[PDB]
């Protein structure tokens, strides 16, 4: 499972849109049910959901609206197949207070 | 490099630089029957946090680290060579490789 | 016959050229030391 | 090259979309028309030597066309998007793409009248 | 004078951090096994 999130930093009160590719060991689309849960840095899962990749070509677009009163830091998204819950795939997105910088600095 | 071939470029050859509110044409060169998923993201967010980005190198690294082999070639003897490759070879006479009972390769 | 070809490569600016053939004692043409030969032309943009 | 500019500005000031419609729709429609028909033709018209004459006939044709274009966009935004809730912001987002597409097609067609 | 009136100027309003969340299929006929799709996007503000 290859989690893809559109951005890499979200302000509170903003919507996160992410995708969950589902591929088998040859890197081909496969139809299997997934489990995804979004856990704040205290490791306490917040949203639990179940999907199926059948008739979807192995691309599952999803969403979540970050609650207004949340804790900053590295949030995590954990996804795993239903059959083998021992293997967990993850991707971290950061919730922070920010306004977009106007320029890039390279050292 | 990936099994297929995907690339994105601009329909307008050179022209002048775009303008906020001006349309643009994207040309996508992918294999027939494929389904592409698009996301357009500002560069300020990558200025703030450039971690957890998706790229082909990461996918190939993840696929490679989940191999069955253990050493890039040769071994103590035939049983060692086959086990290092990640196979089993059993004959009616009796020449068979050593048993494996651990998922992760030793050290 | 001699042709003067005027180019204009402004993207969207129409131009107002004033060409002129200075007098030469060798050749013979309408130009003279007393009277000058001027065409005041108009060049549409990106046009010859 | 400024008298023509003031003329075409006088034409686009006579446009009128009624107030009774929702505010964000008004801003969307006016921003589309301003960025697709007021910047490019102002750029084109700014490059005429003053002796050149405009042709307000196709400019008023422009305005009649943009009235019907806006009317169709509103009809598609309020009635057609039955796939979503009526008067929804994302319904406006869905219809705005083809609104601006039709509008750029109109501008491309009418670029051949600014000269007499 | 040679100034745009205040009411005529309309402000840029959409400043999305990331837009174009679209999924598309390549159903066009293939040439050299490499299909080509032209799609139209109106740039954000």
From Swiss-Prot, chain B:
It comes from the Eukaryota. Transmembrane segments: none annotated. Disulfide bonds join 70-105. Changing residue 35 to W: In AHUS5; leads to impaired binding to the regulator CD46/MCP and resistance to cleavage by factor I. Acts as a chemoattractant for neutrophils in chronic inflammation. This is C3-beta-c. It comes from Homo sapiens.
UniProtKB/Swiss-Prot annotation, chain D:
The keyword Protein transport does not apply. It comes from the Eukaryota. Its main location: secreted. One of its GO terms (cellular component) is extracellular region. Disulfide bonds join 58-113, 81-91. Associates with activated host C3-convertase complex C3bBb (C3-CFB). Interacts with host properdin (CFP), a regulator of the alternate pathway of complement. Salivary protein that potently inhibits the alternative pathway of complement system activation in the host while having no inhibitory effect on the classical or lectin pathways. Binds and stabilizes activated host C3-convertase complex C3bBb (C3-CFB) and inhibits its convertase activity. Enhances accumulation of C3bBb on immobilized properdin. This is gSG7 salivary protein.
């Amino acid at each position: 499972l290859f989690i893809q999130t559109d951005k890499t930093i979200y302000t509170p009160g903003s919507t996160v849109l992410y995708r969950i590719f589902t591929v088998n060991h040859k890197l081909l689309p496969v139809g299997r049910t997934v489990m995804v849960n979004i856990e704040n840095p205290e490791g306490i899962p917040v949203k639990q959901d179940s999907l199926s990749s059948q008739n979807q070509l192995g691309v599952l677009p999803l969403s979540w609206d970050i609650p207004e009163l949340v804790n900053m830091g590295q949030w995590k998204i954990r996804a795993y197949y239903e059959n083998s819950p021992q293997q967990v795939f993850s991707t971290e997105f950061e919730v922070k207070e920010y306004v977009l910088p106007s320029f890039e600095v390279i050292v | 490099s990936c099994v297929g071939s995907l690339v994105v470029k601009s329909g307008q050859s050179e022209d002048r630089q775009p303008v906020p509110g001006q349309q643009m044409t994207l040309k996508i060169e992918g294999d027939h029957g494929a389904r592409v998923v698009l996301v357009a993201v500002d560069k300020g967010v990558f200025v703030l946090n450039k971690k957890n980005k998706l790229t082909q190198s990461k996918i190939w690294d993840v696929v490679e680290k989940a191999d069955i082999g253990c050493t890039p070639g040769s071994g103590k003897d035939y049983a060692g060579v086959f086990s290092d490759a990640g196979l089993t070879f059993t004959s009616s006479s009796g020449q068979q490789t050593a048993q494996r009972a651990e998922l992760q390769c030793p050290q | 016959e001699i042709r003067a070809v005027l180019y204009n490569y402004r993207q969207n600016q129409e131009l107002k050229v004033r060409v002129e053939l200075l007098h030469n004692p060798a050749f013979c043409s309408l130009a003279t030391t007393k009277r000058r030969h001027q065409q005041t032309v108009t060049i549409p943009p990106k046009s010859s | 090259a400024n008298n023509h500019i003031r003329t075409v500005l006088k034409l686009f000031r006579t446009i009128d979309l009624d107030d009774s419609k929702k505010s964000f729709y008004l801003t969307a429609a006016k921003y589309g028309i301003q960025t697709q028909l007021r910047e490019p033709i102002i750029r084109i018209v700014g490059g005429y030597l003053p002796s050149t004459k405009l042709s307000e006939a196709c400019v008023k044709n422009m305005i009649s066309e943009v009235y019907e274009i806006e009317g169709d966009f509103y009809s598609k935004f309020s009635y057609a998007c039955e796939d979503h809730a009526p008067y929804s912001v994302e319904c406006l987002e869905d219809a705005r793409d083809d609104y601006l597409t039709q509008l750029v097609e109109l501008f491309k067609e009418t670029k051949k009248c600014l000269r007499e | 004078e040679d100034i745009i009136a205040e009411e005529n100027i309309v402000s840029r309003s959409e400043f999305p951090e990331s837009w174009l969340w679209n999924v598309e299929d390549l159903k066009e006929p293939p040439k050299n096994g490499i299909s080509t799709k032209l799609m139209n996007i109106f740039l954000k503000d």
